[PDB]
Amino acid sequence: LRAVANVLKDKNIIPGAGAFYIALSRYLRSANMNKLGAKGKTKTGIEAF
Amino acid sequence: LLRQAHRFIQEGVHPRIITDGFEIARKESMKFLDEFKISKTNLSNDREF
Amino acid sequence: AEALLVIPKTLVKNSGFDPLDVLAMVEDELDDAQDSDETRYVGVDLNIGD
């Protein structure tokens, strides 16, 4: 009942079945090489995440 | 997340950079979260959905 | 590819230099070598650390 109630209150929805986890893991990996605006040692924390 | 960071701990990586890299990736994940989310209409015709 | 990195990693480790720092400087130098369109030979320096 609470999962359905959150759809009415919060108009935003996200797909499941690992759709958000796979898309976010691949995006952050390729974006770190194009940006390079943090630090060299930060790549270890971004790749591990 | 501790298992993936365990390999870096044995190599001499300080845990602060490991944690600082997570906050940077968390802020970048919020920007991708706004583009990835889909707004659902409040209309009552979504009962089928 | 990651298994062959142990040789440059343990080479600076016995000297006391941070093995994570040398991997960041060399990798960033190889990326700028392709943008300038020239052949650059990069190697580790044990005395200075760069």
UniProtKB/Swiss-Prot annotation, chain A:
Name of the molecule in the record: T-complex protein 1 subunit zeta
Parent-protein start and end of this portion: 399 to 447 of 546
Record text on subunit structure and interactions: Heterooligomeric complex of about 850 to 900 kDa that forms two stacked rings, 12 to 16 nm in diameter.
Gene designation per UniProt: CCT6
Leader peptide range in chain numbering: none
Cellular localisation: Cytoplasm
Functional note: Molecular chaperone; assists the folding of proteins upon ATP hydrolysis. Known to play a role, in vitro, in the folding of actin and tubulin. In yeast may play a role in mitotic spindle formation.
Species classification: Eukaryota, Fungi, Dikarya, Ascomycota, Saccharomycotina
Species of provenance: Saccharomyces cerevisiae (strain ATCC 204508 / S288c) (Baker's yeast)
Family membership: Belongs to the TCP-1 chaperonin family.
